Amino acid sequence: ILLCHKHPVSARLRFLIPTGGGVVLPQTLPWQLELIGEFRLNMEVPGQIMPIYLAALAGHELPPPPEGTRWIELTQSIGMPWLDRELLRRVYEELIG
Amino acid sequence: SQQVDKIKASYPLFLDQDYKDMLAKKRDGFEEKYPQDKIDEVFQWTTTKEYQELNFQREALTVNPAKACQPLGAVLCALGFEKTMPYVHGSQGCVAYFRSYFNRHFREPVSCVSDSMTEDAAVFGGQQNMKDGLQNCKATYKPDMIAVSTTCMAEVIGDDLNAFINNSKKEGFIPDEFPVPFAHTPSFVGSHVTGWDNMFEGIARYFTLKSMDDKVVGSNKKINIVPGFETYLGNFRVIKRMLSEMGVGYSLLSDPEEVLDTPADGQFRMYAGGTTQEEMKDAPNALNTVLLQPWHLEKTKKFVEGTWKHEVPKLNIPMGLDWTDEFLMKVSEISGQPIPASLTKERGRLVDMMTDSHTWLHGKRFALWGDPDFVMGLVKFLLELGCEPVHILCHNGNKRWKKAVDAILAASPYGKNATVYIGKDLWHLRSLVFTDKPDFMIGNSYGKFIQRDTLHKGKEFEVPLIRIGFPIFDRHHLHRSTTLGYEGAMQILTTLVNSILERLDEETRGMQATDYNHDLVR
Amino acid sequence: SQQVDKIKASYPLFLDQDYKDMLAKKRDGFEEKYPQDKIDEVFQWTTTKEYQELNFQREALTVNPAKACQPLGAVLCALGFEKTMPYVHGSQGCVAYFRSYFNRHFREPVSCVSDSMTEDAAVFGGQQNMKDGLQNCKATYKPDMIAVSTTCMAEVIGDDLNAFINNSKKEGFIPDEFPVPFAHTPSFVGSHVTGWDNMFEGIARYFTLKSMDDKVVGSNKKINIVPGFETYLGNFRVIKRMLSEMGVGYSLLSDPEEVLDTPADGQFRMYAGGTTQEEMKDAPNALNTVLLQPWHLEKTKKFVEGTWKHEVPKLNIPMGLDWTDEFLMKVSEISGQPIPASLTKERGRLVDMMTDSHTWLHGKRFALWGDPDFVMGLVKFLLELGCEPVHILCHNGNKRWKKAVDAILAASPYGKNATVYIGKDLWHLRSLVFTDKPDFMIGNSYGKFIQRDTLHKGKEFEVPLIRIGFPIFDRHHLHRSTTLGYEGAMQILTTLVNSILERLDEETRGMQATDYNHDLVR
Amino acid sequence: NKKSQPGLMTIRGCAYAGSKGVVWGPIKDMIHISHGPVGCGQYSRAGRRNYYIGTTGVNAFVTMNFTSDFQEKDIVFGGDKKLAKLIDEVETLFPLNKGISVQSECPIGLIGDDIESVSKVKGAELSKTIVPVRCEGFRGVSQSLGHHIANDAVRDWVLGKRDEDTTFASTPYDVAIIGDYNIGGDAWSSRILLEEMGLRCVAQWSGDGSISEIELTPKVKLNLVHCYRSMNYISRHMEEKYGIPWMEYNFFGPTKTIESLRAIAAKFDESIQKKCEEVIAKYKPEWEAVVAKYRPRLEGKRVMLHVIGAYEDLGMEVVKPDLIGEKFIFQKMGIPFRSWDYSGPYHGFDGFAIFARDMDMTLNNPCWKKLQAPWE
Amino acid sequence: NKKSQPGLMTIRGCAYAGSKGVVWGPIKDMIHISHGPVGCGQYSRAGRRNYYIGTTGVNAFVTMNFTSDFQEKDIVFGGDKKLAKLIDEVETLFPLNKGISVQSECPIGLIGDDIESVSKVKGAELSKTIVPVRCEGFRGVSQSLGHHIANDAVRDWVLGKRDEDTTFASTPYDVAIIGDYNIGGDAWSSRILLEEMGLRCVAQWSGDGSISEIELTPKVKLNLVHCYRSMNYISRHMEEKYGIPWMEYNFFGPTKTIESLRAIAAKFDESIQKKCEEVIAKYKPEWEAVVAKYRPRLEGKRVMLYILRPRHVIGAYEDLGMEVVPDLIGSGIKEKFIFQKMGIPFRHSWDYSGPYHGFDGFAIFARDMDMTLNNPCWKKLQAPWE
Ligand SMILES: C[C@H](CCC(=O)NCCC[N+](C)(C)CC(O)CS(=O)(=O)O)[C@H]1CC[C@H]2[C@@H]3[C@H](O)C[C@@H]4C[C@H](O)CC[C@]4(C)[C@H]3C[C@H](O)[C@]12C
Ligand code: ICS
Ligand code: ICS
Ligand code: CLF
Ligand code: CLF
Ligand SMILES: [Fe+3]
Ligand SMILES: [Fe+3]
């Protein structure tokens, strides 16, 4: 599950990602949350095909992040490995693009 | 309160007593404003020489700059070509600002597109943005050519314009034979005139670099004219008119005067006139290439001399009397066409106007600013008129240009009290016109505030502004004026002498106090 | 006292404390001046409506007229012919005043001679004066033609110009074949435009009346253009340029723009350009004759329709947009030439400027004055701009012209608050602008004093002057402007909108008082 | 609220335009540094007509352009030291400024500059409120993200500066005008009506706004929001933190103005309602005269476009449109077109007269009837 | 003083120009009617820069144009009734005027109009000084006869008004400035020097002149005549009637100014001479600095002048080291643009500058001469390709 919040007015896309590493949730890649049906992505982990969906936090106020998690923007992903940067790009293109 | 018979706009509606009381209550109750005597003391300090010394020690802060960024000049250059869309690869806000700026200066529609680069482009680059933007622009506006510049975003993230355009052509987003010239225009380097130079060099390279084998200098018996960053349509028109009068075949590359002066007849024209692609392709076949504004056409000069093998003449901007004469002589020498009697008569009429107005013009002190070539041409014309430039400011000038202007000033007795400033903004010029008061300022609309500041010191300290340059926002249709050639010299002379006479009339309009000098004949 | 570093002219030298004290001592000791409070009371009374009632009851006194005498217009008309000497049979002081007036307006040499009629001429007549003057003028200035007008002296004593010139030719003072057209120009009839009309009619009768047997209308496929009393060289230039653009063969009779714009090249040119005698002799062969200013060309119209058999079109002055359109359409119909795309584009550009500036031009109130045709053209253009010409003054207008202007105003919603005044002078207009204050006043330099008067009542009562008309003495090179055609309308619109903008900028330059509306973009 | 199609001509601004141009720039007693190259600050200088009262260059700096003027060295090596030196020079040359905002342009966030740390250090050193705004133009799809970032900066650096300060004497009629940028004096025309109603406008920002007014905003009883789109973030934040209710007011046209005045007065006691009735009665003849003068010459005209009510009050249909509310393109097409360009105010009863006069002037100008050449 | 040759571009004016334009027009508190058609009044309106202090249209009327505006009926039937009605209208619309003059244009003396009787009748009725001037332009050969006629009118209608009045407090240092028309403030620059000498300038006309000053002129001890040509008649008449000596003073250039100041002070006691020496010492550094600044730029230049008696302007040109015989030519506006077309630097109206008289005027004169003679525009007459 990839967790993000898009503001209804400014369209500010903030991603709820673990503070340690990666962007996926609830575990490292090997609230009123609404699922985005049109978004689906599959990654071929050893011995299993794993789908990841998009959950959108509804409302106008960004909630404080839980422990071990942080709200980041696409620009803040600079320096992070390519794979989760591309995942964030796919989410951004589906939501903002 | 509004009376339907005499409706008041913001001025002087907010001068009404109720509005004055409400504003005073707002200021006293919640604004926590500094005391009025205190503001007066600080302003008087800002008008002093000590404040000028503190102001000229600035190294990191720029206040009221007198320059723009490169992609604006690139857009202006792109608008000068036939059915050409300016395309600034980068963020949309840049294009919005460019369009608003040129709309306010020209009071005309200004066409320009962006590929709307955003955070995703900040992370991954704008290759997909380039492909989609080129495809959509070609499909929607049907331009014959798309001239591509860059915003600071694409320059900082290191977007390869050539590779992006080549990949767009390869993947079928645009046809391979569709002309897409490009130029890197870093807004942190130079100014808008640098962007104009870069865009023109990119277009010329795109159209001529790979086809120089079949080019012979002088084949078409024409002269290439590169105007540079020019925001006076009258200058394009006067150059074309003078070349036509001389009987000289010419190619005015980047001619935007038609698209910036579209008639209002119930139909909107996105494109109008402009340099054709055939003219660009046939440009190396010209006898020579004359740069109207050489001091911001360095890259264009290098490309023309190193690729077209054109012996570009050492010509100043055709401004004033002597430099227009030199331009006409050089054109005559290159083309072999004698200067006709009509141009001689026009020069004589300009000399007659100078003789008629020299009494009012002589000894007048001017603080001026603008682009390097325009500023140096104005300084040369003022020296020709017997006027005294005192503060010559060019925010986008360099050391070599300053040395050339100093050499020009030293050659005239009227340049003794002249100082040339490069890299200084209009706050520096405000300090200069406070500490060393000139008679008048010559510059764009941004100088009006300076005038206001001078009027705050007192009527005797007020420096009136003369709106010559770019951008002029608070006046209408001044962009149609001419500053080049004898016609431009006459227009500038008339503006200067009539500004002097208007100021004198205002100063002598007081009945029984100063109206003894309110002469009917001046 | 004077400081050599900054030498002061009369202003502000006489503002010095010693000069102020000396002037105060003079006034208090020997001038026996009225007390300042009484002067202020009388001025305030002169600004009132009851003073306007007293002023408009004037029957015998004229204060600050807005017209001149016939021989001035006759001299101007004579200056428009090739190598032609204006020769005013009468007193020398008239010619001196004419030359000084035209020198101050045009800032150019003005050639005109007088036969120096004196008391002996007052007793026995100016026949000997005419003979000697014609002989001396022909010997000294070698003109191709001498055009003879009259001063009030010769008209009052009743000198017969025809008999005098016939006796001069018969007795050998001048060759019998030498062209000496004449016109009676009584200064107590009409105004300077009437003198222009009389001079042109006399020249046309001299060159055409006796040789109409072989004349066929439309033989030369040209259109005669009579400009009338015109003091804008740009008007002649724009008429010629527009007719050349249309491809229309034309004959501009009385073309003085060449002799009034001689170049400064170290040589004095007594004559330059002008209508040739062959053009005048071939005038009846034209397809038609177009009068640019029909309201002071009545005698010329009668001669041209009655002798040349030309069906002179009923055309207004080509001023503004609609009347320029009608002039171009009539020229197209007469000549059979279509209106070219360049003129259509220029008209569209004028419409575009009108659309750009309509927000600042709409609803503005103007008090204007000048010659009848110029005034009615200006009123028509102002109505086309949405402006309100509240006070229309024409000292040399008549009842028929007033009826025509009233009909024009009734055809526009913006003429409801407009009043036409004929036979009124600038003191009447001063009363009008004090009692019914307009936003601006358009007129010659004589309006500046009115502005001064308004500024004496207060800054809020000041009516700024826009200098369009004749004569303009306190500004330089405004005679080169254009008021006819789309180009003239463009120049007028730019002047009006920019005058409004300078007025607004001056009214909003007060820091922390009115500078909230001191907008950069307008 | 999605990304615009690349390669299309759009009027969308950037986050810098939304933050510096709209929200932060009108604050008169503050100095706003366009951090980055010269272009963004130059094109936005005095572009918007956020009217204010002050001595420009001494205690007010709205129409001035403070910029870092980034060069290639600033891009390569960063501009944090340049920002600190610039802040020092600003304090030297403009002592009467009451605060500094640093509005980031596109390169600032791409070269890894930390303007937050510089702002904190310099604000602590100079005892000055320095507000870093991460309003890079490439962020977001329009000016809406600029509004959001500017509102967040206001909340984080300015709004809570008087949270523990109880020295402000409050009245039950305390209101704050939010989201009115005083375009041509719109906020003043609204404030005169509000204060005639017996209310005390403690805060009015951004238009003619002071930093002290922003700091005093959390002390008011009601938040009257003019532009919900740009200031809804701060409105909701104040509602949740300080428990201050907010309502949108519309003073565009006499009918909407009367309705909004009555709705605002309903929040307060009977005396405020009576004062609102007196204000409505006093201003009724003026707007009635405006209608009687201008509606007959504007009745039945079609407008192609909050602002509906004023058009209806002039009897104009709203949707061959006679008017379009991209200006020069429609001007070339020949349809009259109407931030207000060069006029105003249009809000309030005083603004309605100007609005009606301008609509009649533009719609009925003869210039629109001269488009066709008589020979074509 | 002979008749100019007909048809030879004569530069001379008329009698009306010499009377209305020169002598009567500068009188600020009087209203001067250009009696006749509109042209003469229109062309002479504010043509000369006779500077004055006053509220125009209320108590001063110099730059105004009052005319009878003769029509055909006025020529056929006369304009005496029209003149009387015009005088009544002037009284009703300009109540603060302190006198009226009626300057005749050419038709007045030809249609047999009697303006003297109208003037006497209306002046008796209104208790106002009305001066009829028969300055018809055809009279004489130039403006000299106009000066003579205007001087005779002054003598016959204004000068002797206070003959029987002895209430004026007279001092031994009473002088009257005659013939200075205050062109650009020349008379003021002369008067400041004269009064700094301890003298009391009781009268100063026509320039910045009042009718009361003309009436008070017979009370002065000395008559300082600036323009001998125009006011020699009135000076001689005053000498033979009131026994007032008159002398010509030249304040054009520091040398002539010092010589004239000493000559004037020699007509009074030792205190006036001491004050003259003090004034000369005070103004010596200023004109010395002006000379040091401008003489090097103007040394050796040749001048030809055709504008008055000669040697009046020669002194100031020699004070700048400018030889007088060309690098500069001084004439009127009618020849100004002609000699400009020849390309010779050119300088009546003072080219809308001034004053040129006195020490303060010398600085302006030197600056103007340097500006015109050394202007670069004179070096650009030849096209560089020709
Ligand atoms: C009071 C004033 C005259 C004062 C006077 O006589 N000064 C004479 C000047 C001489 N002195 C006294 C000032 C100096 C000396 O002589 C000092 S000494 O006696 O020699 O010691 C009279 C004369 C002209 C009058 C105005 C006009 O009609 C126009 C108008 C008509 C309306 O219906 C009512 C208002 C108006 C404004 C009138 C008001 C007033 O009625 C005026 C100013
Ligand atoms: S701030 Fe907004 S686009 Fe609310 S970015 Fe935009 S000066 Fe518009 S509809 Mo230009 S949300 Fe203001 C606006 Fe409205 S610039 Fe002005 S007119 S009331
Ligand atoms: S009066 Fe004469 S033409 Fe003596 S008519 Fe003329 S203000 Fe001249 S050379 Mo103008 S005899 Fe005065 C004169 Fe000299 S008007 Fe002035 S400058 S010193
Ligand atoms: S989207 Fe907005 S306006 Fe654009 S840059 Fe970015 S913050 Fe600024 Fe700036 S200097 Fe010129 S105009 Fe740009 S290319 Fe850079
Ligand atoms: S010499 Fe002198 S200026 Fe000449 S008329 Fe005679 S008084 Fe007068 Fe007058 S109106 Fe025109 S300008 Fe004459 S023709 Fe008559
Ligand atoms: Fe336009
Ligand atoms: Fe000239």
Residue numbers in the entry:
A (entry chain E): 5 to 34, 66 to 132
B (entry chain D), C (entry chain B): 2 to 523
D (entry chain C): 49 to 353, 362 to 375, 417 to 422, 427 to 439, 443 to 480
E (entry chain A): 49 to 355, 358 to 375, 418 to 439, 442 to 480
The article reads:
Biological nitrogen fixation, performed by the enzyme nitrogenase, supplies nearly 50% of the bioavailable nitrogen pool on Earth, yet the structural nature of the enzyme intermediates involved in this cycle remains ambiguous. The MoFe-protein is a heterotetramer with the homologous α- and β-subunits forming an α2β2 dimer of αβ dimers. Sandwiched between the two subunits within an αβ dimer lies the intermediary [8Fe:7S] P-cluster. This cluster transfers electrons into the active site [7Fe:1Mo:9S:C]-R-homocitrate FeMo-cofactor positioned within the α-subunit.
The structure of the MoFe-protein purified from HCA-deficient cells (MoFe∆nifV) revealed an endogenous binding interaction with the protein nitrogenase associated factor T (NafT), of unknown function. Given the structural similarities between MoFe∆nifV and the alkaline inhibited states, we sought to determine if NafT can also recognize the MoFeAlkaline-inactivated state. Alkaline turnover reactions were performed for 4 h with and without NafT present, and subsequently subjected to concentration and S.E.C. before structural analysis. The cryoEM structure obtained from these samples revealed a 1:1 MoFeAlkaline-inactivated-NafT complex at 2.33 Å resolution with two disordered MoFe-protein αβ-dimers. Interestingly, both active sites contain identifiable density for the FeMo-cofactors in the resting state position, despite the apparent absence of density for the HCA. However, within the MoFe-protein of the MoFeAlkaline-inactivated-NafT structure, the residue α-Arg277 displays an altered conformation relative to the resting state and is positioned between the cofactor and NafT, blocking direct contact between NafT and the metallocluster. It is possible that NafT is indirectly stabilizing the FeMo-cofactor within the HCA-deficient active site through interactions at the interface between the α- and β- subunits, potentially precluding Fe-protein binding and thus preventing further turnover of a ‘damaged’ protein. We further demonstrate that the nitrogenase associated factor T protein can recognize and bind an alkaline inactivated MoFe-protein in vitro.
